């Protein structure tokens, strides 16, 4: 099936998913010298106080921390968005080396990892309907660099041993995603896609300018996860990132001067 390996990686995905060569694919390189400030934009509103995390799952590609999205508990509004977008899950993309791992790049810079907080537009009723719409999803992307530890990440790191292999899950209640955010909510935004198959062009991307720092120990534990299932030869879960795709007929807008 699709993956990040030697014979099924991003360069092959177009055979099964021809939209991989589409007009609004993600990620992209963010050129800070061509993105333009848009005074029409508003501040982001991140309302995560009532978030209800449920479970963490190794899906064979990354791990998802899943939320109750059956009410407006953890929502994203404002910015470029019209309406209300509910948090369904977050996950990360990361490298085998600290010099790669992010999906978006900034002036061609790769970060060590990238956090995706995935939200769907409540006007479409559920996630599966939302991904069929151009304005179905809002993904808040946050870069990770290696430096100091991120205290709010540690609960995630310490459950990883329990979900080492594909298809394992564990209870993951009472996790506060606010502990993953940087100080600033300044952002870039553009229209794009899911970065994994089916690569649907349903995402308003909101990529924060300020990275968070995680420690070398935290990243090393991410790199101990496995793509494989239990009882199969070990394939470390690293380098689960798609490279930058052509911008084509899009503009990246900044919320900040
Ligand atoms: Co992602």
From Swiss-Prot:
Protein name: Carbonic anhydrase 2
pH dependence: Optimum pH is 6-8.
Outcome of mutating residue 59 to T: Reduced activity
Effect of residue 139 to G: Weakly impaired activity
One cellular component (GO) term of this entry: apical part of cell
Organism placement in taxonomy: Eukaryota, Metazoa, Chordata, Craniata, Vertebrata
Pfam families, per database record: Carb_anhydrase
Subunit structure: Interacts with SLC4A4. Interaction with SLC4A7 regulates SLC4A7 transporter activity. Interacts with SLC26A6 isoform 4 (via C-terminus cytoplasmic domain).
Annotated EC: 4.2.1.1, 4.2.1.69
Other remarks in the entry: Target of drugs used in treatments against glaucoma disorder and breast cancer.
Gene name for this UniProt entry: CA2
Reaction(s) catalysed by this chain's protein: hydrogencarbonate + H(+) = CO2 + H2O; urea = cyanamide + H2O
Entry-linked Gene3D superfamilies: Alpha carbonic anhydrase
Consequence the record notes for mutating residue 196 to S: Enhanced p-nitrophenyl acetate esterase activity, but normal CO(2) hydrase activity
